[PDB]
Structure formats: structure tokens, C-alpha cells
Amino acid sequence: MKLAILGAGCYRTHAASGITNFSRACEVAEMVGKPEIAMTHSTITMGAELKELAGVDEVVVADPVFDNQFTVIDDFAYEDVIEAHKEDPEKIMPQIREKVNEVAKELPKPPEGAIHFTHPEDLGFEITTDDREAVADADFIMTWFPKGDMQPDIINKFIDDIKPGAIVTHACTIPTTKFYKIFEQKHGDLVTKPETLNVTSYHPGAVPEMKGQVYIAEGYASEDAIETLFELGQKARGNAYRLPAELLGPVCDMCSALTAITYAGILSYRDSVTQVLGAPASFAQMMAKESLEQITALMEKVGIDKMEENLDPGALLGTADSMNFGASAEILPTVFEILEKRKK
Amino acid sequence: MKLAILGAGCYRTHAASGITNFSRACEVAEMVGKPEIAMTHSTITMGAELKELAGVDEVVVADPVFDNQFTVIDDFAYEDVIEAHKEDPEKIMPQIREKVNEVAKELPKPPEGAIHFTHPEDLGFEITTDDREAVADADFIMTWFPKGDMQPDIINKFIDDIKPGAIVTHACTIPTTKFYKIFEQKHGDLVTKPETLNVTSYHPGAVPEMKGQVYIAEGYASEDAIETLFELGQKARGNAYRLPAELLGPVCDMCSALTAITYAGILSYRDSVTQVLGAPASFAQMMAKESLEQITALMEKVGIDKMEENLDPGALLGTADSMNFGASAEILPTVFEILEKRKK
Amino acid sequence: MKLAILGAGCYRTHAASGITNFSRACEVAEMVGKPEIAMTHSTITMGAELKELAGVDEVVVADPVFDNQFTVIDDFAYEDVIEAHKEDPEKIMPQIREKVNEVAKELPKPPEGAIHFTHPEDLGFEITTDDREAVADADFIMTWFPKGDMQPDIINKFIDDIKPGAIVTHACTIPTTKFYKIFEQKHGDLVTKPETLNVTSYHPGAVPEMKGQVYIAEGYASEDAIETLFELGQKARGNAYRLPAELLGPVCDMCSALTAITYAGILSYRDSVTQVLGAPASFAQMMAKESLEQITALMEKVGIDKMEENLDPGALLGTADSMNFGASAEILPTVFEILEKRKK
Amino acid sequence: MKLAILGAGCYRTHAASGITNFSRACEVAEMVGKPEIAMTHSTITMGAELKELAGVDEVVVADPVFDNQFTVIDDFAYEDVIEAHKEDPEKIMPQIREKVNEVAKELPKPPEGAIHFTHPEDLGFEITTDDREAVADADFIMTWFPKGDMQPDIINKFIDDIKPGAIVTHACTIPTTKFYKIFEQKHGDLVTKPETLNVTSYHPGAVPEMKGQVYIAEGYASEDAIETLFELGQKARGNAYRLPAELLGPVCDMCSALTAITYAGILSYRDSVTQVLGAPASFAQMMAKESLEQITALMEKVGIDKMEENLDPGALLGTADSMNFGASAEILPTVFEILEKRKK
Amino acid sequence: MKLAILGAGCYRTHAASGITNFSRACEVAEMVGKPEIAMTHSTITMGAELKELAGVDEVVVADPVFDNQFTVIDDFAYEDVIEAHKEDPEKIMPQIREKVNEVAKELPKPPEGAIHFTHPEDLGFEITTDDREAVADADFIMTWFPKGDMQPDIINKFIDDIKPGAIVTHACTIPTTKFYKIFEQKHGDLVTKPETLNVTSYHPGAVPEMKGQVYIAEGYASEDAIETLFELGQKARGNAYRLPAELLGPVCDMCSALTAITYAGILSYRDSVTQVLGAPASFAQMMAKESLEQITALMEKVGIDKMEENLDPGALLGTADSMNFGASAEILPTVFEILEKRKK
Ligand SMILES: Cc1c(O)nc(CC(=O)O)c(C)c1OP(=O)(O)OC[C@H]1O[C@@H](n2cnc3c(=O)[nH]c(N)nc32)[C@H](O)[C@@H]1O
Ligand SMILES: Cc1c(O)nc(CC(=O)O)c(C)c1OP(=O)(O)OC[C@H]1O[C@@H](n2cnc3c(=O)[nH]c(N)nc32)[C@H](O)[C@@H]1O
Ligand SMILES: Cc1c(O)nc(CC(=O)O)c(C)c1OP(=O)(O)OC[C@H]1O[C@@H](n2cnc3c(=O)[nH]c(N)nc32)[C@H](O)[C@@H]1O
Ligand SMILES: Cc1c(O)nc(CC(=O)O)c(C)c1OP(=O)(O)OC[C@H]1O[C@@H](n2cnc3c(=O)[nH]c(N)nc32)[C@H](O)[C@@H]1O
Ligand SMILES: Cc1c(O)nc(CC(=O)O)c(C)c1OP(=O)(O)OC[C@H]1O[C@@H](n2cnc3c(=O)[nH]c(N)nc32)[C@H](O)[C@@H]1O
Ligand SMILES: [Fe+3]
Ligand SMILES: [Fe+3]
Ligand SMILES: [Fe+3]
Ligand SMILES: [Fe+3]
Ligand SMILES: [Fe+3]
Ligand SMILES: [Fe+3]
Ligand SMILES: [Fe+3]
Ligand SMILES: [Fe+3]
Ligand SMILES: [Fe+3]
Ligand SMILES: [Fe+3]
Ligand SMILES: [Fe+3]
């Protein structure tokens, strides 16, 4: 298998957030005995995992920055980073963040400059600035691009060079639907077998040097492609989730808390209805559909900031008690406390 | 099992059509050795099949007509009808149609009058005019009502008397969606297990005294209820089809020919794409979706009578040839002949 | 009239398909006594037809490739191609395909390289690499561009240089709706007469060197512009079809077979209903709308590959027979055979 | 031709409005020399016109009120009403209104009581309380029913007694779409020619005893039926309008003023664009669509009462002047005055 | 405050229209005693107003044209332009238009060439060709770009250089919704405070050198940002309007006349209903919604050019009279005259 990584990333925004570390990269470095992995970031971490843990034989990284100001900070010893991450990463992260922040004051932003600590060539990756050459014969094209509306112009330079059947993954900067539309080939004048590509995601939560795990979007790749990528992700990232593409946004670090609350509510309510009340799941679903749709419509109509002046949180208290049994009895206590505090 | 048939039917429109006979009723009469079944019609045929072939122990028929002018024509011997249907039903059907047509000139229409040839009491059915009493303890309520907008007022008289879990079937005079809405119980003030009913269909093609077979709508009954009814229908009607409720209309005697052509086209096209061209089914589906949606939208925009002045049938000929292989090669010959004759 | 062709095309994918030839180009070459037309392809064939058969006085072809590796293969004599196409094109096409395939191994793809056999300058066309200069004073701008999402950036370089009222046509790589949006001028601050353009298509089936005919999209150009282009296409391509723009995709070589089957079904069903049954076309249309919409919705809900496990093909057989008369009786035989073979 | 009028009407709400008279009924009375027509109202006026001016040979009026308290006020001489309506109807209308108002204090509302001044039997109409018998053999069924949600139960008693092809008209108390749904016969089990009815309207503006004219809804009857009814209406009501059914509501006495303003604006704007600016009508239409849709959406979003706090009327003044030429220059003066007075 | 103007504009289309002048620029020149303002145009006028009347301390103009053929016409004395605009601008505008038209024959269009009369550096503005440097530290980014589909590629070069919270305004060449989508940042992997921008408009009617006033789109910026911009616009442009973004198009110089007519109708009808009839505004709104929606749907269904053959203008006359009172009585006279002339 040949992996082509399109976009090496820059550390600057990771450092600037103040809240990331190298825990996962350090774990992988120790697993495979290659200390330089410990300070990889972004797609370089993910490529090193795929190469060293999942048997991906050939890795190329393409990014225009390699002909510009690709900057490798060498101030930090890999073994010191590994050691700090064994107990408290914040022993060393403040020094790293301060150095990166200083470099980023004058170093241009990508693709003119990028900040790394391990050169990808030292991981056995090929490097290039030519996306067309990187994707040649690639089985897995891992794209890591800026914001979605810039992606068609980037991709259309190399789309016709992609190997038929290749797995192509998108960054969270674009919805899967829109990324797929770049590749979708519909109508034609010559009846030849289409060069179908398998569009999906290989998207980490947080930043991949910090956390394992990976999210694989379903809906736009074959089952075989999803299974292949899921198994790679299990080996390389430590765990993987395959999920409908339309749920990627809702499970990101900004949104997931709300999706999680709502989902826990749906599942708990469903189980109270079917397991204790004894009604069909379809009954739970009909009630849930109307409840979810109407609370969502209220938010959109009046604004999330004005919901309480339209629906007093206290209005729910008396009637919500009626379903306080079974699975829902685990979650309602906290909900009642919250709504009691917020009632008019 | 108790079956409550709500609506006995009238033969008059069957006779008036000029195109029906008693072939199936005669077949069942011979199978079970009860000649009087041979001239049943409508729900009475279906009830006799369920009782005599599918083990339904108790049958009641409710219809207001039993207190009005329920008319049993006795001019025809069951054995003569059976004998005629062994080779040519039209030996006897013209005499039957003429008699029914004459009776129908003065006999009021249902529910004031109804024309039968076998009294249901002679089949071992209970008869009543009270729908509320008929449905008491019934496991299968087979409704056979006039046009859909009259059904809520009829049903609401007995809906609260129905046994929880009962299977309730609707006539083709109402869509399943609308029939279900009569029964749907949504919101409530007391958390008790809902008295869920299993809404479906048991609908024959043509008229049931003429043809076996039955259509069972999916979407609004439990899987167990659909399976129960499907197995009853196999035994009682000789065959059964379970299908999404929304397809009932499209498979009726007025519509099915078009649905059949379109479906045969979809399946043939799909198979050419996947089996010969080697593309994924999803590719066939994306093309089919746009093709079907746009040809449908054209019809709606300009009228079915004006399609050819907008899309010349000849416009399709050259390009349609490009997919002339595999399964599609069986159906395209006739299609090309048709479009060639219709081209501008 | 001045025609500006934007995009000369490359033969490589035509050769690679294994299924095209020069039949139409050869026919035109013989009609006008210019053998070099016989090995034109793509827009060059169409331009030669317009110039030599439809009186278009001035033709310019613009393509960046003219300053890059525009490659004219001279291995094949025009008269040998013409002679072979009189009886069996496959006497010579394999040699041509093999040569093109070999050249295409190393020649860059367009716009860096392109494969032709007749230089457009030898047809009396002006050549340029500047789209802005090509479109100056052009009455007909025939665009032949890659995939639709690349077209705005190409077109916006020259859109303000187009002559008011010009006819502008798009390749099948973009839907007419989306191409039109590039040109649509809505709001403004100075009330001056808009420089309205006439957006349509001039799109051949298959490849134009192989087959005559042309498809002209309606909906986004004046009636006068459509009529002008239709008459040019009749003369230049031998026949023409004008059709709603939204039907272009559905009539392409990949899709047309399905559209053709469905359309033949609609027309046949309509005619049985109106001509034999004697009902209004509106009755046929109401049934057809529901049938088409529901069979399409089923496909989308369960997948084209799973339709039969939801709607048994055999379910249609009994009821479809009821409309077996009139025009529908020509098409139903094949349909019944297909559904009988596929029934559960 | 046989006309069946279903609903005789009651005068009480006409009198109570304080604003109606018998001008049209008096005109018809004088035209045909039958003074008793002068104090007909509602459908009785329209039936008398159809019989006496349009050759309708047979008229029956059905209404339950004929077996209840059908009340004919005889206090007023027809010739005195005719004479007053020659110059000032308000010489006599106050006396009539006061008498009707007094009678209506104790007389039950229809169908238990109804107030007339001319018994329909004295116009040569048959009277009945049985709708089923009235519609027998009727070519034109003029329904005049209360509010739409009561109409299915009324109509379903007689729908199966209607002559195939009959013209059936609805009161303004129901939209044509909903009335049509009562009659629409879709699916069926026996392929016989449907008994298609021609659903339309014959609806007067104001009250028909006061004003001539009639509105005939298009969309749900054959062209022949609409033409027949239009020609009857021209003769009987003095003028007629045929219009899309969906525009009936918008042209009623409550709504028409707004529809008229908007329509005059659309037509004036269109003509300025095409005739003076010289742009295609499609350009005017694209601008008008967005303008109409967005002003409508604003009203719905903020409420008709809050539009000005969102869109200052003065915001339109400067830019609207730019189209002040041609047809629009006739209507803009008043509009500018209005918006100037309303500006913030 | 730092204002970055992205796009200096070109006068050529203003001159070519034949209908603009420098009235507002001259007024501002006289107000602040800087004659060179009198022949500014486009964003330069607006920048000079903001600097000289609204206290904006720092103005930079970025445009690629400054490194190409930025052309300052010096044939006209500022004081002569000011003097002419005191009484009749057409004393001098024809000479200006002719000169500009001649220059524009050979000068390339922007961004290769642009026509001005006052160099922005002579107004105290910084000039640059680098948008990224112009937006650095800018509080108000006034963009003035060509057609919307070119804007993402322009903006994405500098979007990450914008100061958090900056106000960013768009030209009328793009809808606010689409411009906002360029900037919208949705999902993310690191929970840091988003760098929210305040997207709105600062759009003049006509051309800003001719007319004061400005339109500020609501919906995509904070209330504080809208208020800030509204107050700047009041001072700098002389008046300002804040309105829902979706109404910008409808109030442009091409569309406003129709929007104005319709809005005046809505307000007049509403007031007749509430103030004279005494009904709730919600009653007026329900009627208006149906009227507006249906007249709009008719236009779309049949075409703006075919409305009268479907809805006779005369059909409205009789019923529209019924609401002829109150506010509507001011506007109906003209409407009735128009519809009377147009009736069939
Ligand atoms: C900071 C950051 C991050 O955490 N996550 C993601 C993706 C995700 O979470 O799904 C991205 C894109 C990112 O931004 P970053 O700037 O680190 O990476 C973008 C990369 O994208 C590269 N790039 C820009 N244009 C091109 C191009 O035309 N081709 C290629 N191959 N790389 C390109 C840049 O130089 C840069 O290395
Ligand atoms: C002729 C005919 C037919 O072939 N198929 C169907 C149904 C289908 O194909 O799905 C119907 C309804 C039908 O009409 P028919 O008039 O034969 O049957 C309607 C029956 O419905 C009965 N009925 C009317 N009102 C009531 C009521 O309130 N309760 C009951 N139980 N039956 C009622 C009538 O008296 C009559 O016997
Ligand atoms: C092979 C092929 C084909 O059969 N049909 C179509 C259109 C259709 O069926 O509707 C296209 C576009 C095509 O692709 P091909 O690569 O042959 O043609 C695209 C042409 O488009 C040219 N091109 C690319 N960028 C530009 C540009 O900016 N301007 C112009 N004028 N041509 C351009 C290319 O160099 C090339 O000659
Ligand atoms: C006052 C009034 C009016 O001006 N316009 C309309 C219609 C329109 O403008 O389109 C109606 C219905 C009306 O109400 P009105 O009460 O005058 O008329 C309703 C009539 O409808 C009759 N009616 C009620 N139920 C039935 C029924 O079952 N059958 C028949 N035939 N008439 C019925 C009533 O007794 C009454 O005579
Ligand atoms: C004539 C004209 C006008 O009246 N109004 C508007 C806007 C509105 O009414 O809302 C525009 C855009 C216009 O077109 P004009 O050609 O005058 O202005 C476009 C400007 O936009 C500049 N431009 C083009 N590309 C870029 C770019 O990448 N960056 C910047 N800063 N300016 C650019 C051009 O050189 C030019 O000066
Ligand atoms: Fe991400
Ligand atoms: Fe998210
Ligand atoms: Fe049926
Ligand atoms: Fe049907
Ligand atoms: Fe681009
Ligand atoms: Fe094509
Ligand atoms: Fe297609
Ligand atoms: Fe009315
Ligand atoms: Fe109305
Ligand atoms: Fe503008
Ligand atoms: Fe506009």
C-alpha cells in the first residue's frame, strides 16, 4: 500500500491553543522504538502510525511548503518529551509553546511556512511539492487542506492522476458531501467503467499527536474501502469509529457535548418506553421525532438566547416526572436540577 | 382467531364492469367441498377462504345492509357456476350479469341494498349491523369501506372497542397513511402502555372471487403482525405479497402496468451497469434517480399529453444504444421500436 | 458569424475507450471534398462542419495547449481512414488506437498536451491561447471545458469580453443550470439594458467525429437563439434535438437507456388510457405521477440493489395484466417476461 | 340542460352587512319581464338568470330547509324594489334590512330556517329536500354549502348519484383543491372508464343579487366544461372570468385590493423593463420573483405589523426612482407619496 | 479605526451609463474644503467621507491595479466640476463621459487598468497591491469585488490575516448569504474562542459619487457592529438604512420600484384592515400571504409575459372596490386605472 499525504500541517495553531500535547505521538514512539515520532504532529503522526503500526509500506508527503520555509525546530530532545509525557506533559509543553509562538511571529503561515520538530524524511517518507506525483499509484490519499472552498482548485490539479478505486479522505474543513461532489463523475458520452473513487475520512479528534482515535465517514465509499480504513485505523490510531458522514460535524470537539447529551437522552427515553412501558420502539420514535423537531424549530424561530422567554424551563418539570423510570431515571435527576434552577 | 369483516360488499359494480367472474371462488368451493362458496364475492369470499383454508375459527360480518335490503339472488345453481368455470366462465357470466344489472336498476345502493348469491349465515358467519359488537375480541378486523373521507366517521364509532394489538386492514379506497392516522394515538396525560393496533392491508387484485392473491401493506404494523397476515394470505388467497404501503396504489389494476414497465427498466438498467459494465450499484442509482426525477418533472411541467413536443422520442435513440448490452438488451428492442414510431 | 471554440480537445480518451471511430468526420470530409476533416475530433469536427456545411464564416479555436505540447499525429493518411470507414472502420481503428495509446503514455494531459491528427490551422481556423481575444466579437462561443467546478475560474477571465447577445454553449461536464449561474447578472446600481447572453448547449452524443446529431438545451436562451442554433445544428451535425436543459444528463450515453424505457412506458400507458379506455390524459398523468414518484422513492429509500426484497417483481404481474391493451400491449410482453424471471 | 342547485341560501347575513342591495336581480327582472326575480338572492338569483337568460331548461333547488322553516317575506312589492333600484336603492333597502333583522332574531339559522322574498317554486324551479334526487341526471350541480370541513359529509351522500361528466361547482367556503379531493377517484381494481366529473366554480363577487359577474376556476375540469360554463356565465351573469382555481381566494372581496395592487405593480414593472429598457421579460421575472418572495418572507418572519421597523419605507425611495419611466411611471407617484409619509 | 478598502473601482462603466454625475462627491468636497474629493468615485468617495466626516483615522486602499495601469485623468479642474454641480451637472458631464469613453477604448479593464480623477494618495490614503497587508489590524474591511463567484479565491488569500471582530462588507455582486459562507467557521478540533467576524454591507444606491445614502445588511454581524456601521454611514453618507440582508437585492436600482409598489400595497392594505375594518393585523397577514404567494406562483408557472391570458386584469376590478377605504383608498385609484386599461 502507498499512502500519499497531501498537507503536512503546521504546529502553530496547536501551540497557540495552549491545550495540546504529544501524548499519543510519544506512546507510538515508545511502541515502535523510534523516538523522533514523539514530536510529530498532524498528518505526520498519522503517517508514522500507519507506516510503523499498520504495515503501510510507502508514504509520500506533498506540500508546497517544502520548497518554501519548512521549519524544523530542534531545541527539544525527543527523549525529554517522551519522559515528560510519562507523568506530566506540562513539565515541557510551556517551553515548547513559547518557542513555537516566537517562531510563528515572523514565520509565514502555510503554505509559505510550517513548523515541525521532526522532518518527515527522517521517518522514511518521500517528500515532494507536486501533488500530482504524490498521488500517482497511491492507494490511500490523505488530504489535509484548508477551508473547503479552496479545495476544488487544489484537487482538480491532480484528480485525473488518482488511481481508480483509491481511498481519498478529507479534512474537517469541508463536509464529506461537498468533498464528494468534487470527485463525483455523473454523465458521460462513452460507456466505459467509471473510475470510481472511495471518498471517506480519517479524521482524528483533538490533534492526533495528542489523542488516538479516528473517525471514518460512511456514505461515499464502498463497504470494502470503509472496512479497510477502519482496520488500518484500529491498528494505527488505536481505535476507530465508522459513522454516517453527516455526523462528523456533530461529533467534533466543538459540538460533541450537545450531540452526546441529546443522544443519551434519546437512547434513555427509548429504553424506558420499550423496556418498562412495553411499547414498540416506533412509538418512542414518533414521540421523539416531534419533540426533537419542535425544540429545534423553537430555537431557530426565537434564537437560542431567547428560548426560556418562550418555553419556561419550569413548564417541563411536572410532566417530565411521568416518565421517570427505567433508563431515563438515570439522566432525569440532573435535568430536573438544571430546569428547576432555570425556571421562571 | 376471530375475524370481523366490516362491509359485506355489493356485486353490482362487479357485474356492471362486464369483465369479472367467479374463478377463484369456484376453485375454493371445490377445494373444501362447499359449493355455496362458488358464488361468494368481495369480503365474503375472503372470509370463507380464511375460515375454510386458514383455520380462522370465528367470522362475523357487520354491515348496516343486513337490516335494510340485503338481497340474495337464488336464480343460479352453485354447481352450474362451478361447472362453467372449469372451462369457459362466459358460458354463464352473461346471464348472471344481466340478472344483477336488472336487480340493480331498482335496488338501492349500499348500505341500503346489496346484491349477493350466498347468504353469509350459510357459511357459518355471524351477521350483525353493529360494528362495535363485531369488533369485540376480534383479532383481525377486515374493513371494506367506501371512499376514504367517509372512513373516520365510521371507524370512530368502534375504534375504542378494538382489542389491543388487533390487525386492522383497509380497503383501497383510502391510502394506508390516511387510514393509519385515524388510529394513531400520539400524546397523552397518563403514562400507560398504548393500545397499539397493527394497521395494514389484505387487499386483493381485481375482485377476490375472480383471482387469488393478496397485497399486505408494510410500515404501520409490527413484523409479527405482517408475518401472521402474510401466512394467512398464502393459505387463504393462494399467494401473498408484502410491500411498502406507499406502493399499494402504484400496483393496483389501473396503475400497475406503468409501475411494472418502469420497474423492469430500473432492474434491467441496474444489472447492465453492475454485471457488464462493472460499476457499483450506487452509480446506477445516481443515474436512475436523476433520470426518473427529470422525466417525472417534465410530465408534471408540460402535461403528459405534451411531452413529445418538448422531448422528441427520437432524441433518446442514438444515446440509448450505448447501453444496449446485458439485461437491458432484452427490453430495449421494444423500446426502440416504440420511440422510432413516435419520433418527430 | 464568428464562432469561438474554447477547448480543442484531446483524442486520448476516445482512443482509450476502444469503441469510437471517425465515421461522421469521414462523411463530412467526403461531403465537402476536404479529406483532412476525416480525422478531426471533438470541437474541431464540429467547427469544420459549421464552417463547411452551415456557412459560419470565421472560426477561432482557443486552448492553452497551443503554446504547450499540441501534438499532431501524421502516421495515418486521411484517404485510408475514409476508405476504411466506407465498409469496416475496424480495419484501421486498432492501429490508430494503439498509436494514440503509446503517445499518451508520455505526452502530458491537456492543457499541457493534446493529441490531434489535423491541425486546426489547416482547416482555416485561427488559433490562439488567449480566450479573451477569441471571444471578441464572437456570435457563438462553444466551450469545451473540463469538469464543471473548474469552469467559473476559466470563464470569469473572459466573461466581460463577450459580445452582448452571444450564444454560449457548455460541455456536458457541467449542468446548464450551473453554467448559467456563471453568467447570470442579477442586481445592479445603474439602470442600463443588461448584456444578456444566450446560454444553451451544442452537445453531441457519443463523440462528434463518430456520430452526427446534437442536443440543444432550452431554458436559458431566447427562442431566437435556440432556433438559430437548431438550424445550424441541422445543417452541420445532420440532425438536432432541442430539449429542456434538465434532460441533458438523462439523455447522455450513460443514462439514456433508462430514460428511454421509462418514457416509452409513460407514452404507451398514456395512450392506452386515453385512446382505449377513453379517460382524460389528466387521469393517466395522476396515476403516472404517483407510480413514478413512489418507485423512485423506494429506490432511494432501500437502494437500487435491494428493491426486489421490498417489492417482489411478481407482485406486479397479476394487476399489470389489467391494462394489457392498446399501446401498452406492445411493451408489456417483454416486461412480463422480465418480471416473471425475477419474481420471488 | 338540468341544473341542480344544492343550497338555496339565507338572506340574513346579506341584510346584516348593511351594504348590499338587489341591483342585479332587478336588472334581470326587467330584462325578462318577471318582477319576482327582483328580490331573489344567492343561488336563486343565479338559477333564475341561467333559466331565463341562458336557456337552462330545468332547475331544481335542494335544501333541507324546505321541510323546516323556509320563510318568504311578503312585505315588499317587487315593483317598488325595481323602482327604487332605478335611481337610489337606499330608498328601500333600510326597510328591508330592518325587517330581515327582526325576522332573524327568532328564526333559526339554515338549514332549520332561511329567509327569502320569492319562493323558488314561483320561478318554475322544482324544490326538494333530497340532494340525491336533485342531482339525478343533472348536467350542472351548483353547490352552495357552508364551511368546507362540513362538505365531504354532505357530498358523499350523493356523489355516486352524479351523472358522469357533470359540471360541479363549489362555494367560496372551500378551496377548489379541497373540493376536488372529495370527488377525485384514483386507484381501482377494475379497469373501466372513470366517471370523471368536471369540478370548477361559478362564484359571484359580492352577492349575486347585487352584482353581475362570475368567477370560474380552472384546473380541475375539462376545457370543454370550462368553456361551457364561461359561456353560460357570460349570458346569465353578464360577464365571466375564468382563472386558475388557486387565485379565487386572492380575488375575493376581502383580498382583491391587495392582489390588484401587486398585480398592477408586476405588469407595470414588466412593461418598463421590456418596452423601455429593452430587456427580456425573463429578466423582469427573475427580479420580480426575488422581490416578491423576499417581501413576502419578511412579512411572515416579523409580522405584517412590524415590517417598517425592519425595512424602513424610506429605504426604497432613492433606488425606486431609478425605474421611474414607462408604465411604472404611472404608479410610482402614489407609491412614493405613501412611502415618504411612512419613512422613519 | 483603520479602514481597508479592497478595490478602488474604475469609472468606465459609470461614464458609459450616461446617467451619473459627481453631485455627492462635490457636496462632500465643499463640506470639508478639499476640492479633490469632488471627482472621487466608488470606494474612494466613500473612504474620503469616512476619513473626513466620520473620523476614520487611517485608510488604506488595496487593488492590484496600482502596479498596472492605474490612470488618473487630469483634464478636469475640481473647481469647475464643483461649480457645474451647483446648478446643472450636465454642463460638464458630457465632456467627462466622452474623455473617459475614449480612454476606455484602449485602457485594459480592471485589475489591469482603472480610471480615476483623484489619486487616493492625494487624499491621505495608503496604497498597496497586497490585500494581506491592507487588512492587517483593520477594523473595517470594505470589499469592492467583481462578481461573487470570483470572491472566494480573492478572499481566501487574506481571510486568516483579518483582525478578530473586524467588520467586513461585501459588494452587491454577491449576496450576503454567500459572502458570509466564505467566512463562516463551523467545526473544529480545539475548543478556543472563534475569531468571529462581523459580515455586513456598506452599499450605496446608484454610485456613491452621485448620491449619498448607504445600505447595511443585517443578519450576519453583531448588533454592536451594525450600530457602529450605521452611525458611521449616517455621518459619512448622510443617511443610512439597516435592513435584512435578503432585502438588499430587492432594493437595488433595478428592483426597488417593484418592491416599493408591493410594500406600499401591503402597508396600505394592512392599515385599511386594522384601522377601518377593525380586524387584527394577523387577519390582514393571512390574506396577504395567500395573495402574494399565489400571484407570485402564477408568474412563475406561466411566465410574467403571460399572466394576463390567465388572470384577466379586469377580474380584479369589481372585488377590489370592496376594500376601497382607509389607506388603500390612496393607492387603488391608480391601480384601477391601470387594470381597466389592461382588461380583456
Ligand atoms: C492546523 C490544522 C489542523 O489542526 N487540522 C487540519 C485538518 C483537520 O483537522 O481536519 C488542518 C488543515 C490544519 O491546518 P494546517 O495549516 O496545519 O494544514 C494545512 C496544510 O495544507 C497545506 N497546503 C496548502 N495548499 C496545499 C496544496 O495545494 N497542496 C498540498 N498538498 N498541501 C497544501 C499547507 O501548506 C498546510 O501544511
Ligand atoms: C364494490 C367494491 C369493491 O369491489 N371493493 C371495495 C374495497 C376494495 O376494493 O378495497 C369496496 C368498498 C366496494 O364497495 P362495496 O359497495 O361493494 O362495499 C362497501 C360496503 O361497505 C358497507 N358499509 C357502508 N357503511 C358501513 C358502515 O358504517 N359499517 C360497515 N360495517 N359497513 C359499511 C356497505 O354497505 C357495503 O357493503
Ligand atoms: C475528452 C473530452 C470529451 O470527449 N468531451 C468533452 C466535452 C463534452 O463531451 O461535452 C471534454 C471536455 C473532453 O475533454 P478534453 O480534455 O478532450 O477537452 C478539454 C479541453 O479544454 C482545454 N482547456 C483547459 N483549460 C482551458 C482554458 O482555460 N481555456 C480553454 N480555451 N481551453 C481549456 C484543454 O486543453 C482541452 O483541450
Ligand atoms: C350567506 C351565504 C353566502 O352569501 N354565500 C355562500 C356561498 C358563497 O358565497 O360561495 C353561502 C354558503 C352562504 O351561506 P347560506 O347560509 O346563505 O347558504 C348555505 C345553504 O346551504 C344549505 N345546506 C346546509 N346543509 C345542506 C345540505 O346537506 N344540502 C343542501 N342541499 N343544502 C344544505 C343551507 O340550508 C343554506 O341554505
Ligand atoms: C463599476 C463597479 C461598481 O459601480 N460597483 C461595484 C461594487 C458595488 O456596486 O457593490 C463594482 C465591483 C464595480 O466594479 P469595478 O470594476 O469598478 O471595481 C472592482 C475592483 O476590484 C478590483 N479587484 C479585482 N481583483 C482584486 C483583488 O484580488 N483584490 C483587490 N483588492 N481588488 C481587486 C479591481 O481592480 C477593481 O478596481
Ligand atoms: Fe479536524
Ligand atoms: Fe462540530
Ligand atoms: Fe380494492
Ligand atoms: Fe393505482
Ligand atoms: Fe478558484
Ligand atoms: Fe459530452
Ligand atoms: Fe446521463
Ligand atoms: Fe362566496
Ligand atoms: Fe380572499
Ligand atoms: Fe452595487
Ligand atoms: Fe435588485
Swiss-Prot record, chains A, B, C, D, E:
* Class of enzymatic activity (EC top level): oxidoreductase
Q: Does the keyword Oxidoreductase apply?
A: yes
Q: Which domain of life is it from?
A: Archaea
* Pathway annotation from the record: One-carbon metabolism; methanogenesis from CO(2); 5,10-methylene-5,6,7,8-tetrahydromethanopterin from 5,10-methenyl-5,6,7,8-tetrahydromethanopterin (hydrogen route): step 1/1
Q: How is its activity regulated?
A: Activity requires salt; 100 mM sodium or potassium salts of chloride, phosphate or sulfate are equally effective. Inactivated by O(2).
Record keywords, A-Z: Methanogenesis, One-carbon metabolism, Oxidoreductase
| Cross-referenced Pfam families | HMD (PF03201), HMD_N (PF22616)
Temperature and activity = Optimum temperature is 60 degrees Celsius.
Characterize the pH dependence.
Answer: Optimum pH is 6.0-6.5 when making H(2) and 7.5 in the other direction.
A GO BP annotation: methanogenesis, from carbon dioxide
- Classification via Gene3D superfamilies: Hmd, C-terminal helical subdomain, NAD(P)-binding Rossmann-like Domain
Q: What is its EC number?
A: 1.12.98.2
The catalysed reaction is:
5,10-methenyl-5,6,7,8-tetrahydromethanopterin + H2 = 5,10-methylenetetrahydromethanopterin + H(+)
Q: What's a single GO MF annotation on this record?
A: N5,N10-methenyltetrahydromethanopterin hydrogenase activity
Q: Tell me, how does this one assemble?
A: Homotetramer.
What family does the entry list? Belongs to the HMD family.
Report the protein's function: Catalyzes the reversible reduction of methenyl-H(4)MPT(+) to methylene-H(4)MPT.
> This protein is called what?
5,10-methenyltetrahydromethanopterin hydrogenase
Which source organism does the UniProt entry give? Answer: Methanothermobacter marburgensis (strain ATCC BAA-927 / DSM 2133 / JCM 14651 / NBRC 100331 / OCM 82 / Marburg) (Methanobacterium thermoautotrophicum)
Question: What is the organism lineage in this UniProt record?
Answer: Archaea, Methanobacteriati, Methanobacteriota, Methanomada group, Methanobacteria
Q: Which gene encodes it?
A: hmd
